Design a protein around this ligand. Structure first.
Ligand SMILES: [Mg+2]
Length: 49
DNA sequence: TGCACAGGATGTATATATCTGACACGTGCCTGGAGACTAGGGAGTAATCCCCTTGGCGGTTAAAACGCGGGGGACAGCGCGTACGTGCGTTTAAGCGGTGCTAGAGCTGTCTACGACCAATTGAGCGGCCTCGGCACCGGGATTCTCCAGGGCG
């Protein structure tokens, strides 16, 4: 979810981010895909919308 | 001699004159009915401001909700005996008729304290405020307080 687990976690596992709906994306939505892209990812991140 | 009868000698409901009690009707003096003047208390309005809502997403917590074991307490059954229920005779005392009283209950003038009604002052009491020492909540630790397992004892 956006507010619960889409804010501070470390997950490096997924290579893809999917967004069903985005209300605010100056910042708040940018954090969601940045939960995916991290230091431990050696693969390019493909982010859809 | 045993017996029926004709009339008196008592009862008894029956019908008549008589004694309370309560409804019904005819008054006149403290009530109501009503007319006019004053006026302040009630009906009506103009802001107002002020706390009280509008509508619904999520995240999380504390409180509400459900589920089972069983332990003890509600609860049915049943025997006992003494404690009132029921029935007599015997007594003390209230009900009631009647009486002599009085001392307190009950309606009415006097005036006189004495409280109702109305200006003038103010100060003690109410709106406003802003602090700190008592209060709210919880840790530390000692203390008590109940729960469960032998075992020494039946
Ligand atoms: Mg961080």
């Amino acid at each position: 979810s956006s507010r619960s687990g889409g804010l501070g976690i470390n997950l490096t596992g997924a290579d893809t981010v999917i967004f069903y709906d985005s209300d605010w994306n100056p910042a708040m939505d940018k954090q969601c895909q940045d939960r995916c892209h991290r230091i431990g990812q050696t693969r390019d991140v493909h982010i859809y919308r």
